[model samples]
Target chain A: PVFTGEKKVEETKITAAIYDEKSVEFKELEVGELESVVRSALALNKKLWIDVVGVHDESLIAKICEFLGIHPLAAEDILNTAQRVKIEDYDDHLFLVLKILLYNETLEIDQLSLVLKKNLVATFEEREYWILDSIRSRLKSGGRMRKLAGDYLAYTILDAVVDSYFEALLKISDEIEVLEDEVVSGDSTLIGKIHSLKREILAFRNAVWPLRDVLSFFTRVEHELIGEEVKVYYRDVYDHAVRLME
Target chain B: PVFTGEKKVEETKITAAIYDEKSVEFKELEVGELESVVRSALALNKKLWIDVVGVHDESLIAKICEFLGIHPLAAEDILNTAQRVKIEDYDDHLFLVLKILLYNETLEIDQLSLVLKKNLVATFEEREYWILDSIRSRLKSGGRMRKLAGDYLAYTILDAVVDSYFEALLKISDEIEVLEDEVVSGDSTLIGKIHSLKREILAFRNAVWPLRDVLSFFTRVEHELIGEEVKVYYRDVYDHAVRLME
Candidate 1:
């Protein structure tokens, strides 16, 4: 409700992607239909990935939180988009927040909040980005992601988010490489771009920093919903995070 | 060894400060005298505060570390001044590293390493600074600091390091206040100093960041050397760190 930054134009619409091994479906629904859709998805043992494009609709967020029984504080964190990447284990489910970096005409970062229950993985974002399109394609291919449980599907979503960091870093790395060549040639305007590069690197580091602890918690802590098999994937994500941190 | 940064003029000489409740002494010592002085301090039931001013003499550091039974990896960390502020608990003693910030003509940061044991506290710094002069003055006054155990002495030293962060932040806040006024008055170059201040605050933040975890470990972990009473002091330092982080 507290509009801190830019709000999207399509604020009231909710785009939900529900999928499983045998089938995958996507729908745009109003607030009234969300409860029934989610209930039926869980009834059919489907992994629901609700991607709310904008969080300006407080009642919509509240409706989803109420149905999922998310903690009030965690719900508060959802609306507070400035939160660092972190995870909260609520015994029945897990709440996670991540920064998904995108590079189109400009560098944009969006906060992605996810709630992972036994058969659901609900996500909220400030606006839509194509970062998670790979997950949809993999689900369509009916690969290992399709065979695994809903927890693994959540892992795949998180993995996609973290992989986007590397994607952004690779672009920054290319710039650094080019800057190195310019510095080697003794360019005059090196100071300006160097400071810019430093800011970008710091931004990248901030995005990847708290995520290491989140993945570390996912890998190390014992939880009933997060199975032993999925922990290996979490460990892999933690390794990538450490690599990024270094 | 591997000198990672700018070396001070007095890089070769090692200045040591040995102190306790009954007696406090400051001396410049060679590797040969370290063992004898430490043993004598233990004989007199005194808490030793050995501040080696420079760590360029590898053999000397190895000898001092060998005498004190510090872990080799920790000793290596002491020489690597680029190491992050952290603590390594070896059942016999605790090893900690901190950054001491100084802003004179240019912003300068130095690494301060401490080895906390039952009856001894050994410290190493890249060069001499007057940060711990207050502790020395307190010991001279023969107040509660002098009456405490070795662990409390270590706490005093760490508390001084953590307090220096607040001192630095206070100076930065003053600068930020000035910048705020300048911006209100429509100063154009405010952007430059703002970026510089961001770097300084960030450097200060980086320096104070891991120290929170170090103090948290000291307060939470049960160890024979760190007394429960001293942990209360460590908790106080932790609170200061959390304040600084915020």
Candidate 2:
């Protein structure tokens, strides 16, 4: 709660990909389109997945809050981008904050705020990244994604984030395996790599490790919107978050 | 120290079975014989196992104390009989108090105080019990009994007490296997036995359960007389004390 620097978000995008069994709708919304999309979600027989891509603009964030009937504190939590990883349970919805991990020449990290309500899910992200890319191309298809409620879509998004994390660890595993071999082999080129590589891998540990406890919150807490069958898959996805973190 | 009821001891006997490789000395020590027996232990190239069969007579206990070069606080600990199961480390020795368990129609329990020194051991007992009976017949023969130092003799005594406890559990296990079947079967004969049998077995758990922690003292503490080879066997004995208590 202490640090409130200049609110940092860039070139934001607002996108909706709403679906039910045998029905899939994909659209981007402006402030004008926001009310229609929310009404469109209610008409849906089952589910909706709404996402805000960029986040600095305050008025657009405020209007999205009104259209979705989001709680006031949850709106603040969305805007802060510096919230601790947690679950906030309001009277009608479950709000979760997850710190997202991404790797490149630098280890890129950001916040993901997820809100769950009656047959609906709204996700907020600051910088648009491809952590959930695997599920996007599949949402247009008439198969798996269309056959579930909004909770399962959240699980799928969680799955993609964790599955992508596997790549970073696999990359670390590559260097560790080679470094282990080189250090024991006692070669000259190997001496310079050990401590430098260890420093980077340890930083990757800091961003993603707490996500394990974040997943355990679902395993115990009760949420009506998170259905029994959807919870089984949540447990499965939560298991992935634990066995390998998102 | 709190409850100083009239000190309880009966028909006290002092016996010594001292042995080294290829030679074994078995004798009962009078106060006059005490000096010769101690010098005999010094001449032992290996080990001695001395015991006081009964413990009330202060002079005999005092004589045994000087004969063994035992510590004063440990001497008091041996007489109290109500001392907690524990290990006491001294300048020249290690003193251990163990609660011994026996089961019958009524569960019987006693205390064993053991003192370990350089190539020598002295055990003190209150009631003459057969918990150490398994080792007595073997000492006269020239096999496994004569091969080790005094510390391994302590390990063997711990083993027999724990091994004998396996019998009580086997007996309880016998009744439990039957009680489980009878309770579910709804037999008239079973109705009377469940609480009555449970009452007895719970008392058995109280006495022997603490011997597990008592054995762990050797697993960590350094004792000069307790050999490296003897310690591996102590860890094994400590494990059995944990896996099943004496």
Candidate 3:
């Protein structure tokens, strides 16, 4: 996700509506969407998460905070999207920060910060979905995601994000496996890939590995707000995360 | 290594042997035989370590334990075989776990874990090796391994493991490098390899990265058992591990 230090445009038109009563609809609402669209979704029976791209709005964010019952410090984290991934346990709510990764065909990776609250999962992106069609198609499947609880819904969102990493890793594994094969045969071409791969893995690993720690924490936490059944499902997601890492 | 609670299978084998040396003779005896074989050879100025594998017998282990006067814990680890590559310090002995990896003509990797305690070194693995034969032939011609002290022998074992990682990394590096080379020319294969290279780096990274911590532990461990000279040598291995990881 591209980070713009300052607002570049004075005016932008955005429209959002929930076609499905279960869905929260909003345009360009990254983490700031938490108070409004995100909070509204949280109140519903259906698990709700809203991802906002291009973090250029401020007032809408304040509204989001007002609606979501978020404390000031937590809202500050939403504004400072650059904050490191962390988990904050509140008496009634849990706040989590996760890094989301997207790698393009050029082998360059972009990361977006995801913020997870009690029932609202929010992602702040610096750019529009470079993989717009991919996310759209995946959403259209009425997929396994339809069955998730809020935490599991969060897990599904996270799964989609890490799935990109898996795709990237698979591509990398297949290609590097060849190089590994070549090196065994005494052919050398690893010099360049070493540094580049090192950088790429650093990014991909940063996303996948830490998320495992996050999901695992859910299992270990003694919070009563998180349901027992949901915890079990989160543990399953935790297994996927850990196994993929293995 | 079977951890049925804190009671490790290896520790049990040692206990069983204490009651009857012949009861576990196959495993412990084999280790003792190899140790004595090396010690006598060293005394007579034989350079090679008499590496022995498979120590499943109880009475034999007791007999070997009696002969070596080695600590029971080392015997336990040798018998258990699931210990992470590590170093342990005892009153009169030091225990070390090492990985030995070699790639053959087909680029297949054979990984063997060797456990060394004082003058005795034992290896365990399910893989057949051509590289062990290579090392054996070299030892027959007065290999460099025989020239060093027990610490040096440990270094050689570690050096081989690191070398295998380097080989694996080199292949991954090549694949990534090819993609790097194609970054300008835009090779789809290169794009693919970048991620693959990262994955390979990660795999090798997982294998060798822990060795650094293990080596660092050895370097700083204030144990009465490990000799000062070996500690200095361990510092060298730690340095190598750092350099490889860096």
Candidate 4:
């Protein structure tokens, strides 16, 4: 999906949404309001989705991780943005990292960190964007998303993450074909462009490579937090990821 | 040719030679001795090859470059050793840079810089080793090498450089086949070795890529110093380089 400049004109703050089959509550979480907001969401006993737009504010991030009982290494993984796409099973939570390629003018890569816990999932993004607008809309309307647990919510976000790559990959593929045709015609200058496109393909490949492991891990491991359908959806997502590799 | 540890045990010093079909004289020309050696060689009317085994001594290298009328940019390239394989024709002389893969338990890449002018060619190596031992032996024995112009000498050295890569490439190829067979069986731990080998392939590819251009340029361009046979041999080396790519 094209994440336009207009959507990110104002920075999307640390957003927390608590939703279920009955109703939904969504709001931007302020610095000191995290504990109170989390307490409220905890009491609601519905599925909670915490959308942390950016991890720029370390102290606030530390506070968020502290509240969620996120492991130190997992917290460090979120803080450090240049992570390869992978998943780790910390006994308390499943911490997974993903890369989303957003198209503005040139393709921009953003790191996305997802922490899935029991009925409560937390997400972190490098910059502000409205990537999950479609998912949020689905959850808002009380459809299939509202009926699911936090794991399915994670599945939707990850599926969106995987979907995000297709457009960028298609762009790369189309340009490669265009360049291939151009080579039949001519220019020594074309080598630079070819090299540039090659690097972008590599970046795309590296981003998606470890991601398959993250999904395959779900397929194999029996986790308390991730449900059966979520695991199957992960397998589907894994197939989609495999498609991206080809 | 395999260069063992003993070949590099002692640092090879700055060596200069003036040879002809009739006679050949070689010596380690001291810093002050370079100008006098060139003067004698200029008068002797025999082809000369100056071998600066290391470019660590900047002023001495500058002096060597100055005496030969080597261009300012070429001098800078020699001083800064991490140069990609390339060739630059600066009207006075042709400057070529190449990478030689030396096998001493592991593949070690060394940058070799050569300056070819009328009846005289100078070579620079980042480290001390006798890569051109066979060429030296042939020249000493008054074989076909001494009978040809300085261009033929450059050709032989370039051919030697090209030949150096095959061993390293074969090693990589062998390991790749080994890994491929291993992959047919098992281990997630094997991935690190695969990634390491992938990087080595890229390094090897980058080293050889521009070298093809260097030889191709030699094949295309007409120079005053480089004779017809040298150009044809460069084309042969170009074929060898293309083989390395595969």
Candidate order (lDDT): 4, 1, 2, 3
Deviation in Å, model 2, residue A104 alpha carbon: 42
The residue pairs found clashing in candidate 1 are none
Q: lDDT tens string, model 3, B22-100? A: 1211121223343444254334322224344334444455445445555676666655543434544453444454433
Deviating ranges (above 4 Å) for candidate 2: A1-246, B1-9, B23-46, B175-246
* DockQ for all candidate structures vs. native: 0.04, 0.01, 0.05, 0.01
What are the per-residue Cα lDDT tens digits for candidate 2 across B22-103? Answer: 5555343443346556565465454667877776666667666776778877787777766655655564676777655545
Per-prediction backbone clash count = 0, 1, 30, 0
**Which pairs of residues collide in candidate 4?**
none
Docking verdict class for candidate 4: incorrect
Candidate 3 interface RMSD value: 18.4
Q: lDDT at B217 for candidate 1? A: 38
Deviation of model 4 at B229, angstroms? 75
Which ten-residue region of model 4 chain B has the weakest summed lDDT?
B1-10
User: TM-scores across all candidates?
Assistant: 0.57, 0.37, 0.37, 0.39
Model 4 achieves a DockQ score of: 0.01
Q: Candidate 2 docking category?
A: incorrect
Interface RMSD of each: 15.7, 29.8, 18.4, 27.1
Error of 2 at A54 (Å): 30
Error of 2 at A7 (Å): 38
**Alpha carbon lDDT of each predicted model:** 0.58, 0.56, 0.43, 0.58
Give the least accurate 10-residue stretch of model 3 chain B, judged by summed lDDT: B12-21
Docking class of 3: incorrect
